[PDB]
Amino acid sequence: MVRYPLEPVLSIKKDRVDRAEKVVKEKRRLLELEQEKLRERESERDKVKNHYMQKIRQLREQLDDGTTSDAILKMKAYIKVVAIQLSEEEEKVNKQKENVLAASKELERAEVELTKRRKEEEKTRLHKEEWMKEALKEEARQEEKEQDEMGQLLHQLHKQKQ
Structure with missing residues (x-):
């Protein structure tokens, strides 16, 4: 199972948003x-x-x-x-x-901080999305290349019929 290489960073960035939401509420x-x-x-x-x-x-x-x-x-x-x-x-x-x-002012500052956390988390989420798209395309190209190769092996076997 090939998962996103930066899954640990995304997990963390989700946590940082949770924490900042809680901080905004505490400042309220x-x-x-x-x-x-x-x-x-x-x-x-x-x-x-x-x-x-x-x-x-x-x-x-x-x-x-x-x-x-x-x-x-x-x-x-x-x-x-x-x-x-x-x-x-x-x-x-x-x-x-x-x-x-x-x-x-402490409240205003906490809300600025929450927006920053959410911006950063979203940057990482977007990169996971774009990694996963590329992963999918890469696996498909590999599958296509191997289909060509197996297809040839099979046909070279049928030529070797005589």
Whole structure:
């Protein structure tokens, strides 16, 4: 049984495609984890942002009602505190964004790698196809040559009849 000489390379290249598919899927999942952590950060940021908004509106209502300089100073002092908590949450959100982007790029890179594996595997598959065509033609030429030769031997035997 004459098999393709580079069968071991083709077998391997099929495996490399399997592996790269699995890697793309793993990168999807890793990006999804970061996307989920981004949502948690944004959620935590939104509760501080809402708390800040509630404080501002509460002061704005007091202003509309008429208030005193002391009560304004006290509400404003608390508002400043919350404002810094809010900037700290926005920083946390921006860090997590950086994780999302890196994982996003890692996914893009894995898909480029999968396409490369598939291109290479297909180059080898095509060469197996073309080897096998040539193998078939070669065996046919050999068969044809031997049919000529046996045909002659038979006929030279019948000449030798006398």
